[PDB]
Amino acid sequence: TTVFTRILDRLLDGYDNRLRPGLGERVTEVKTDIFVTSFGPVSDHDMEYTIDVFFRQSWKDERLKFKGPMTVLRLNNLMASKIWTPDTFFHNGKKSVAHNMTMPNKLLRITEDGTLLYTMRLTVRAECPMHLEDFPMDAHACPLKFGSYAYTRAEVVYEWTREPARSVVVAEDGSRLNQYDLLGQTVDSGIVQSSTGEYVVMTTHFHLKRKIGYFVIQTYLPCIMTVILSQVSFWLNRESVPARTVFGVTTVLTMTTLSISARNSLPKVAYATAMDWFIAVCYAFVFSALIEFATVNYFTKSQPARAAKIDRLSRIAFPLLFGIFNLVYWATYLNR
Amino acid sequence: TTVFTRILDRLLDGYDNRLRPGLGERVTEVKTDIFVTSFGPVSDHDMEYTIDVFFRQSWKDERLKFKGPMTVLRLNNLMASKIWTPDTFFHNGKKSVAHNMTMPNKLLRITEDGTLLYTMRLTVRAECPMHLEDFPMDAHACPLKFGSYAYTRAEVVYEWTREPARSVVVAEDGSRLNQYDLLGQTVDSGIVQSSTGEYVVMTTHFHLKRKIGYFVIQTYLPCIMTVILSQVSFWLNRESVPARTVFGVTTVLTMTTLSISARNSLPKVAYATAMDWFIAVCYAFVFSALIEFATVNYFTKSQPARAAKIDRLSRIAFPLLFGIFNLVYWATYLNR
Amino acid sequence: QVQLVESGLRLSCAASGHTFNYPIMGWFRQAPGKEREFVGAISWSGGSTSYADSVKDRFTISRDNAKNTVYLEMNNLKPEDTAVYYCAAKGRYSGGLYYPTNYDYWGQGTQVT
Amino acid sequence: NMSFVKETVDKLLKGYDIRLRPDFGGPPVCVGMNIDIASIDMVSEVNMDYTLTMYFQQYWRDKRLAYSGIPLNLTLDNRVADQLWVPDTYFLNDKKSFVHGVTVKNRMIRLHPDGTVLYGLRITTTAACMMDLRRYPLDEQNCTLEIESYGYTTDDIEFYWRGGDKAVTGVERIELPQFSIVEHRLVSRNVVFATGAYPRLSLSFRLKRNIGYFILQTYMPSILITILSWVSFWINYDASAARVALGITTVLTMTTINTHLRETLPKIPYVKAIDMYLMGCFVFVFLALLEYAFVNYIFFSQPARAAAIDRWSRIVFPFTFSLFNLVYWLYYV
Amino acid sequence: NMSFVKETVDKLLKGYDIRLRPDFGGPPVCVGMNIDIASIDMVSEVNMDYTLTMYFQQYWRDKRLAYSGIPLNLTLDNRVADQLWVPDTYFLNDKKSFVHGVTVKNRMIRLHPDGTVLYGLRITTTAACMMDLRRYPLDEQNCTLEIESYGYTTDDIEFYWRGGDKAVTGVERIELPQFSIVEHRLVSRNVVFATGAYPRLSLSFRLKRNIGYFILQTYMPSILITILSWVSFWINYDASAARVALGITTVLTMTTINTHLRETLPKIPYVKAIDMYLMGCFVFVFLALLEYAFVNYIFFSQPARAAAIDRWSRIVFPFTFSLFNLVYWLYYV
Amino acid sequence: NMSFVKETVDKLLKGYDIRLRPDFGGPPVCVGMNIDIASIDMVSEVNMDYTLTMYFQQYWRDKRLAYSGIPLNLTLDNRVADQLWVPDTYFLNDKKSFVHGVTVKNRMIRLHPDGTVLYGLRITTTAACMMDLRRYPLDEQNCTLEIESYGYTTDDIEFYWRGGDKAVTGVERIELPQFSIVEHRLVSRNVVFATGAYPRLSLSFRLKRNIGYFILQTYMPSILITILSWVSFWINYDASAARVALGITTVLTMTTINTHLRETLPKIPYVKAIDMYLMGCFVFVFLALLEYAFVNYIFFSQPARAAAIDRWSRIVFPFTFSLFNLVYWLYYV
Ligand SMILES: *[C@@H]1O[C@H](CO)[C@@H](O[C@@H]2O[C@H](CO)[C@@H](O[C@@H]3O[C@H](CO[C@H]4O[C@H](CO)[C@@H](O)[C@H](O)[C@@H]4O)[C@@H](O)[C@H](O[C@H]4O[C@H](CO)[C@@H](O)[C@H](O)[C@@H]4O)[C@@H]3O)[C@H](O)[C@H]2NC(C)=O)[C@H](O)[C@H]1NC(C)=O
Ligand SMILES: *[C@@H]1O[C@H](CO)[C@@H](O[C@@H]2O[C@H](CO)[C@@H](O[C@@H]3O[C@H](CO[C@H]4O[C@H](CO)[C@@H](O)[C@H](O)[C@@H]4O)[C@@H](O)[C@H](O[C@H]4O[C@H](CO)[C@@H](O)[C@H](O)[C@@H]4O)[C@@H]3O)[C@H](O)[C@H]2NC(C)=O)[C@H](O)[C@H]1NC(C)=O
Ligand SMILES: *[C@@H]1O[C@H](CO)[C@@H](O[C@@H]2O[C@H](CO)[C@@H](O[C@@H]3O[C@H](CO[C@H]4O[C@H](CO)[C@@H](O)[C@H](O)[C@@H]4O)[C@@H](O)[C@H](O[C@H]4O[C@H](CO)[C@@H](O)[C@H](O)[C@@H]4O)[C@@H]3O)[C@H](O)[C@H]2NC(C)=O)[C@H](O)[C@H]1NC(C)=O
Ligand SMILES: *[C@@H]1O[C@H](CO)[C@@H](O[C@@H]2O[C@H](CO)[C@@H](O[C@@H]3O[C@H](CO[C@H]4O[C@H](CO)[C@@H](O)[C@H](O)[C@@H]4O)[C@@H](O)[C@H](O[C@H]4O[C@H](CO)[C@@H](O)[C@H](O)[C@@H]4O)[C@@H]3O)[C@H](O)[C@H]2NC(C)=O)[C@H](O)[C@H]1NC(C)=O
Secondary structure (H helix, E strand, C coil): CHHHHHHHHHHCCCCCCCCCCCCCCCCEEEEEEEEEEEEEEEECCCCEEEEEEEEEEEEECHHHCCCCCCCEEEECHHHHHHCCCCCEEECCECCCEECCCCCCCEEEEEECCCEEEEEEEEEEEEECCCCCCCCCCCEEEEEEEEEECCCCCCCEEEEECCCHHHCEEECCCCECCCCEEEEEEEEEEEEEEECCEEEEEEEEEEEEEECCHHHHHHHHHHHHHHHHHHHHHHHCCCCCHHHHHHHHHHHHHHHHHHHHHHHCCCCCCCCCCHHHHHHHHHHHHHHHHHHHHHHHHHCCCCCHHHHHHHHHHHHHHHHHHHHHHHHHHHHHHCCC | CHHHHHHHHHHHCCCCCCCCCCCCCCCEEEEEEEEEEEEEEEECCCCEEEEEEEEEEEEECHHHCCCCCCCEEEECHHHHHCCCCCCEEECCECCCEECECECECEEEEEECCCEEEEEEEEEEEEECCCCHHHCCCCEEEEEEEEEECCCCCCCEEEEECCCHHHCEEECCCCECCCCEEEEEEEEEEEEEEECCEEEEEEEEEEEEEECCHHHHHHHHHHHHHHHHHHHHHHHCCCCCHHHHHHHHHHHHHHHHHHHHHHCCCCCCCCCCCHHHHHHHHHHHHHHHHHHHHHHHHHCCCCCHHHHHHHHHHHHHHHHHHHHHHHHHHHHHHCCC | CEEEEEECCCEEEEEEECCCCCCEEEEEEECCCCCEEEEEEEECCCCCEEECHHHCCCEEEEEECCCCEEEEEECCCCHHHCEEEEEEEECCCCCCCCCHHHEEEECCCEEEC | CHHHHHHHHHHHCCCCCCCCCCCCCCCCEEEEEEEEEEEEEEEECCCCEEEEEEEEEEEEECHHHCCCCCCCCEEECHHHHHCCCCCCEEECCEEEEEECCCECCCEEEEECCCCEEEEEEEEEEEEECCCCCCCCCCCEEEEEEEEEECCCCCCCEEEEECCHHHCEECHHHCCCCCEEEEEEEEEEEEEEECCEEEEEEEEEEEEEECCHHHHHHHHHHHHHHHHHHHHCCCCCCCCHHHHHHHHHHHHHHHHHHHHHHCCCCCCCCCCCHHHHHHHHHHHHHHHHHHHHHHHHHCCCCCHHHHHHHHHHHHHHHHHHHHHHHHHHHHHHC | CHHHHHHHHHHHHCCCCCCCCCCCCCCCEEEEEEEEEEEEEEEECCCCEEEEEEEEEEEEECHHHCCCCCCCCEEECHHHHHHCCCCCEEECCEEEEEECCCECCCEEEEECCCCEEEEEEEEEEEEECCCCHHHCCCCEEEEEEEEEECCCCCCCEEEEECCHHHCEECHHHCCCCCCCEEEEEEEEEEEEECCEEEEEEEEEEEEECCCHHHHHHHHHHHHHHHHHHHHHHHCCCCCHHHHHHHHHHHHHHHCCCCCCHHHCCCCCCCCCHHHHHHHHHHHHHHHHHHHHHHHHHCCCCCHHHHHHHHHHHHHHHHHHHHHHHHHHHHHHC | CHHHHHHHHHHHHCCCCCCCCCCCCCCCEEEEEEEEEEEEEEEECCCCEEEEEEEEEEEEECHHHCCCCCCCCEEECHHHHHHCCCCCEEECCEEEEEECCCECCCEEEEECCCCEEEEEEEEEEEEECCCCCCCCCCCEEEEEEEEEECCCCCCCEEEEECCHHHCEECCCCCCCCCEEEEEEEEEEEEEEECCEEEEEEEEEEEEEECCHHHHHHHHHHHHHHHHHCCHHHHCCCCCHHHHHHHHHHHHHHHHHHHHHHHHHCCCCCCCCHHHHHHHHHHHHHHHHHHHHHHHHHHHCCCHHHHHHHHHHHHHHHHHHHHHHHHHHHHHHC
8 A cells, every 4th residue: 555655655746736737848638528417407587507517527647657556546536636637617607516525526547657537526507598589489509618717729728538429428317307308419619719818618509499388288278268268258148248347357357367477487588479479469359359348338229230240240250360360370480 | 921822832732632531531521501692583484493592611621721820711712723622513403604704703711720611603593393283373392402423421421501491591682583472491401312322412492482463464354354245245135136146256266365375374284274274164154155145046036035034044144153163263272 | 977056054056967876965165275175975865964073063964856956054154164165976986975086076166255 | 541542543644645545456445324314304396306414424444544452432523534534425416415514514433443434424415306296296206315436436445235224214203294205215236437337325215295285275176166166057047147257257266276276386398187187177167157158048049948958057067077076086096 | 125024024923822812911902993884785674684785994903013114004915814813803693794705805904013903804794683563664773783702801802983973984875775874873882791791882773764665556556446435425326236346346456455565574463554554444445335235235125314324425434534544644654 | 848847936936925015115016907798697676786797807017926938928727826916806896706616716827927917717796786767667777897906005006907998898799688788988096995095997887778668568558548548438428338348448457557567577665657657547547437437426417517527528638648748758758
């Protein structure tokens, strides 16, 4: 056991952790890969998503060459603070966590030729800008961009360990999405520029498509039922004024409850979404039914035949128009 | 001043803080007392409570004897980290805070005979399991247990500084309770056995009784008013059927809304509370009133005398039964 | 941009423009042979006043937001009060209250004996 | 004589190398784990997680810490844990964890003469438990805690439950307000990642949801409002306003009940059992209102034929509702 | 010369025992406090506290830090504060406090040739403030900040305000959308605990709650609904449905006025002023509905009595409501 | 030859004092600031603040850190920042800020041969911004970020924008949900406190709220409903059912608009213009309803009086509504 202690002391003898490997001689090449243990929930209100990853980096450092009975040293994570490690950060991250229970979730492994494997476990909250013009039938491409913070492309370059499509691996059990479906991911790399120089960025896009069943059984069906219920009033006699008044009032209140319940889901955007259009048209139908009832009641005594004709025409016009609107709306948004 | 520096250096020369006083010789005796500066809010939703305390421990360490111009060294709390202190913890704590503004709120005093007094300011969140059978007329005994974490009863024992009744002192202006009354507390000490051995535990029970004013002016009054409003319908003449129907519909709807909404206060518990029984009886009264109206309207055309008799009997029967039920309920639950 | 107009015992300072970004109004007076001296200050909305020790219980300051005006009333005047007055506006994060440097927009110089 | 103990402990830590595990370069070090569950806190369907507080004990042997001449088990200050080697045990499916630190860090180090080390912590951790709510509120969940080494493969370390099935204690004393713990289970296995194979210990609970609360405040309002809709069959058909108002208000308050129910759970895309029951009750009350409207529409031409169906409304609707209720309860129970 | 100053500071810190307060074993050290309030971020009635951000300055004298030969006041990097002695000042009624640390820790240390030390911090503290809401929304609160020494009694330390009533500045920077600062007061005293007597300072604010929001949101809608409920007395009693619907609508709407603002208040057991006004208006509308019910009951037998009752109600109800408003606004204002 | 670089760096830090600013006792050290705005997350009217993420770079010169013979920009590990003097820059109007620390602390140290130091951080800060909501939703806000030295005065440290108006970049790429950034402005000045004068930098944005959706959502429906309320004046009083229907429809629409506005508006308890406009419209429809009630009560005995009052209302309601709209436009637009 003392042999390995002497080897480690020799390795750390005169080693400077403030200088990157090949400082002024070559370019440090860090090969990275990601194992997504669980793609966490997506927050529409905050426009952010959570992800839990095993983040692995590997690079060559010849100052740590050694020869001994073993070829690979799997050392304690605190040793990672005694040597130089890349300062990778996530460009679009918001508030990330490096788990520290029960010990710092890090592993360091050194091969006899100097190769270092450094792995950590992270939870990242990343920004996912969203265009909600097709809510709740929209698709998104949430990005995850990372790279060095202090070293430019002339000093540290990043690469994927294997083919880019296979360097980001999603675990089968890792799906905490209650509302979206993870179609796939796209892996790319590029160069970014800023006032401090040019840096290398590794990017991974996750493609998500929202599931519509919840809004179908939560907003669309109650609204359709309320509209049909309001249209039911046209079959009653013209004399029953209190009946149709109760019809209108109760339908309006139910629509108000449904609209209040549905609107809180979205963030406070300034444009109009598909759900807003549907709610507005349902409100228009209910209010038009109420106004038609008032107009029919107006012509009750002076021209009863005209009132009967208007009611008879409405009995056909309202359901037909609502069906046409539903067909147009669905054939428009579903195909888009 | 240099004399005190020399004394402090001599005390810590060869002192080892990994070893409890009298290790291998006798049992370290710790005398504890608590000054509750403010008994914080009680959150029956999470079944917990908050409490701010001055926690004082006193023990004897032969290794810290000295003789000098002063009898008591009232040292900075920094010294408290360079000697042995008990590892006291709260068995039923959830997430406590040791305050650090503007400095670590701790005090350490060393007497010339080796007696150490160590005091710290803490904010303890503790679990208080509750039985909500009699809600909102319930009484609780919230516990607070503490003891050593690593030292068993054969190494470290705990005692109260004075008589157990007077060893926990509550500040007079230290009540942050909103809907509870702090009747008093009881103090006890016992032995708890776990897989690592036997330990000494000190327990304090705080007795709380809920204040019923909020639920009187928030839930019981709307229910009583709804029941009275429903029973008002028995006095309208039978020529006004839509009016009585509106009465019944609105009262039933209001009772349903109250029943649904009032269950969003308490945490989900799979048993009925007193308020649930009150709401259920009010709902039964309202539904019975509507059924009576329907029965009267059934006999209006065929047997007018029978319907008139039913209305006349109901006008007396409903208020009398409701008053009797209220008397029984309040007598039962105000003397439980 | 804030414009300050002075009228006027009693003096009135009327402010126009972006008066919300400068929620504090202050009064200063310059002696013929000395530097500017703080007199009083008043929040535009909170209605809280601060006075110098030399003019406590003798001067008063109030404000009304109906027309965006602040009044400085002088009582028990003394001959040693011969200085040119100024009304100034102070930003929300301009620092101290007793220092003329922190004030951006200055009103018309008024001479009162 | 504490000077002898101090000398012994200083000798133990003299040449100790924290960077190397016990038996570094040799056979793996065995670690035996015990758990004493203090309490299981809020089981949240919205967040799909559960909070768990536990005394977590690890047992291993380090021949570098063997001492002689002291017939005692040295219970040392918790800070000495910062100078020894401890396993890098972590919880794979945790979201937010912490070790309690009042009044000091809730940590215990106990050393034995044969070099054995006992290392204890008090941990409150939130752990993710994805739930299948397709039978809510008559569901049965299975929530697990996963324990794994991070940097050491199966060639460097191996876990086991110390004491067999008795390694986890305190489960029977847990009082979950909404669930009842039917069973708990202990599993030991290996998990292969791209960096090698690691030991794994799984502690699983099967939670069965109570039904009294939901029968209280969920199904009963719907059944009562269905009976209220049935009431309309008794009011005389000439009273158009009364029956119209009754049916309309019952239908719309049924929809309101559905909306109120569906906002205490995560926005899952499927349909829970309670949603299907509420939909069935809504369909029944809507059919009753539609039948009343149809009868009122043709009561002028054939008053007898229209009034005949009122008795059938008074009879069949409770019968059909009872049949549907029986089928639903038999299918889901 | 930088080297000369560095060696002077090194000589000052050589042999400096941080564990001992200035004048240890002798007369107490006098510490003067200054506070510059940046803002009061919020005042929460639900949590019963308030958030306050301030510059906290402490002034004392330590003869061990006296230096000669430099006619300058040394403004040192804040990290040197970790090597000096500072008072253990704490706030008794704070629940969560922190010192801002971007970009560095917001801390300041300044030394003078005399040995005087000035120590400054930027602190955000959430201080508890118990409230008496019996006159809400016409209430008036008094929130305090208590400053005390933890480990040092009055024999070891003394507290005083530096500058008397001018010790606290920046009160005009306080901008609460719902309150308004009326007065601030400074108190100095001694507090006796079982361990001894400690110096105590107190900074107290008096807050007056703005009324216009409640007038626009609560009182005016209640008055409008009460007035609308009086239209029933001007309707012929033959229209039973209209009057009953109007009465029911007024009652239900009155029961649901301050729901939006009553979910941001604690579950207090007493009756606030706004609750009393709402209950009075509810009593008025309920009595109007009862009056119509009585008129309908006696409508057929004696129509003249019903007409007289309606005519008298038309005068009695507005007059009694005006008297109620007069008494209420006289008592609470 | 990393040995030569290591020797040079060791020589630079040997004897270096972190308690002394560059040119201690001499001319002030000038610090240049660059800010790159990554994103502005959210602007909150409830909390009167906004969240902003940025790359914050400081540029200065230290003659102690001058090295020769190495023709490179020495980019060092970020931990070297703990062994150097850095400015004590802080944000005056912040409430909670932090420096990102994944995977390491987000910090950059770059030395240059002439001794120039570049020091970069990545900071997410919540900053206070008081808002004037009187003219809501036509309000235009002005949110600032204030940068100041905490300990050193203008005699020791000076601030300036590096590159002038090009110092701050990335504002044009910012997209906000409610607001649109119109113009940003950079200011440099000095601020005098009781302790002396400090340098100050200000970065201010002027935000204009998006107005189309609010106008199409709360103003137009209110105006249309108030216009529709006057149709009942032209309706003859013989068909009272139509007028009752119109009144009920107008009241229902007003309540719906009010509830939706309550849902849209932030829950800040103080007056806004839109609330007063909606209250005025509701008062108008309430007055129309009361006028109809008076007509209904009078028309039976005095048809001429009812006809006359309806005819006069036909002209005096639009005139009064136009006068109210003119007053609202002058007072708040
Ligand atoms: C009251 O209690 C709180 C904790 O509840 C204390 O806050 C801690 O203060 C300590 C001492 O300053 C901090 O420890 C130091 O952390 C530095 C890094 O901090 C950053 O990164 C951490 C995460 O790693 C963040 O949590 C933090 O916010 C910062 O972003 C280290 O660089 C320091 O190391 C230095 O000292 C060690 C000593 O061994 C050397 O080895 C190093 O080389 C280096 O010189 C140090 O570890 C701790 O991070 C703080 N925690 C939190 C949560 O804030 C308060 O300080 C305490 N009050 C008082 C008065 O002490
Ligand atoms: C919640 O849901 C989880 C799954 O998501 C359940 O966990 C499973 O529990 C079962 C037991 O109920 C586990 O099955 C057992 O696995 C053991 C480990 O097998 C591994 O290691 C062996 C070598 O030791 C390999 O040969 C094997 O290929 C695996 O790599 C086995 O040792 C057990 O064997 C038992 O059954 C076999 C027959 O199948 C007998 O021959 C044996 O004698 C013995 O009786 C057994 O197979 C399963 O692995 C768990 N899976 C996971 C993912 O954890 C939880 O049980 C559930 N919650 C509750 C409360 O039940
Ligand atoms: C919010 O509410 C708090 C109380 O909860 C108010 O605080 C009180 O403020 C008053 C002053 O307005 C304080 O009264 C003063 O106390 C001083 C200290 O007294 C201590 O020390 C003296 C000896 O020096 C002892 O005798 C005494 O017992 C105490 O131990 C006194 O020095 C003051 O004396 C002044 O009045 C007396 C007459 O009463 C004169 O004879 C004196 O000359 C002098 O003028 C005075 O008594 C009171 O102590 C405070 N209470 C607390 C708990 O701190 C806040 O004021 C309020 N907020 C607002 C805005 O008003
Ligand atoms: C949001 O609201 C804030 C205020 O709360 C606005 O900030 C103000 O912005 C204006 C510019 O638009 C600033 O005015 C400028 O101040 C500069 C600094 O003055 C200091 O230094 C000079 C000496 O250099 C001293 O004389 C002076 O007393 C100060 O100590 C001046 O240098 C500028 O002068 C330029 O313009 C003037 C005319 O205005 C010319 O006469 C000059 O020659 C020169 O061209 C100028 O005066 C003002 O100081 C800012 N106030 C604060 C408190 O920061 C924001 O602009 C606003 N947001 C937006 C988007 O507009």
